[PDB]
Structures are given as C-alpha cells and as structure tokens.
Write a protein that binds this ligand. Structure first.
Ligand code: 64F
Length: 110
C-alpha cells in the first residue's frame, strides 16, 4: 500500500491481528477492544496504562508512530498488562504469551 516504515508498522500489527493457532482460533480476538470500566473494573484497578489493539491501530492509521519500536513497545505493554491482571492459569494469560512471541518473531525479521 505505501511507505517502507508505514508498511513495516502494518506488517507488525497484522501479524499479531491475524495469528491463528492449529485449531483456527484467532488469539487477538479478545484484545481488539477493552471493555468499559463498569464491565471489567478489576483490570482498571490493577493496570496504570490501559492498552488495546484498537488504540494501537488508531495511532498507526493516524501516522503517529515515528518508529517501529514504539509500536512494539505498546504491544509489549498490552501483553504485560494482560499477564499482570490475569493469573497464569487463565487462557487470556497464555494467549498473551503466545502473541508476545509472535510480535517478537515478526520484529526480528523487520
Ligand atoms: C472477559 C473480558 C476480559 C478482557 C481482558 N481481560 N484481561 C485483559 O487484559 C488485557 O490486557 C486486555 C487488552 C485488550 C482487551 C482486553 C483485555 C483483557
């Protein structure tokens, strides 16, 4: 679609968005948009800096990322948030770990 760095940003975003496991489950589904404060109040009690993929996507679509590693840092904050709020035995916790590996593998390639 356009410039090298915009393309790299898009590739990072899409890799995490589109990832599917062996059963065809899209792990990013629950991460697109945070519920409201009344819907998930314990998250907002626990997490200093709320983050979801729609937030990252908006920032990206408005050309506000000046490098790739800023975008990577926002995803890492998202997954760190998930693994701070949720217990290790939860599925969302395990999904966050997987997608954090997906993110880094993508970044490693450029
Ligand atoms: C039952 C809905 C649970 C949604 C949810 N639980 N824990 C989460 O941690 C997150 O970091 C996160 C990020 C974006 C959207 C949802 C969640 C989330």
């Amino acid at each position: 679609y356009m410039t090298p760095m915009q393309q790299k940003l898009n590739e990072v975003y899409e890799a995490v968005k589109n990832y599917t496991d062996k059963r065809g489950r899209r792990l990013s589904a629950i991460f697109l948009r945070l519920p409201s404060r009344s819907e998930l109040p314990d998250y907002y009690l626990t997490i200093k800096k709320p983050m979801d993929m729609e937030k990252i996507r908006s920032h990206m679509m408005a050309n506000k990322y000046q490098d790739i590693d800023s975008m990577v840092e926002d995803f890492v904050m998202m997954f760190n948030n998930a693994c701070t709020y949720n217990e290790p035995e939860s599925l969302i916790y395990k999904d966050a770990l997987v997608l954090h590996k997906v993110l880094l593998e993508t970044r490693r390639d450029l």
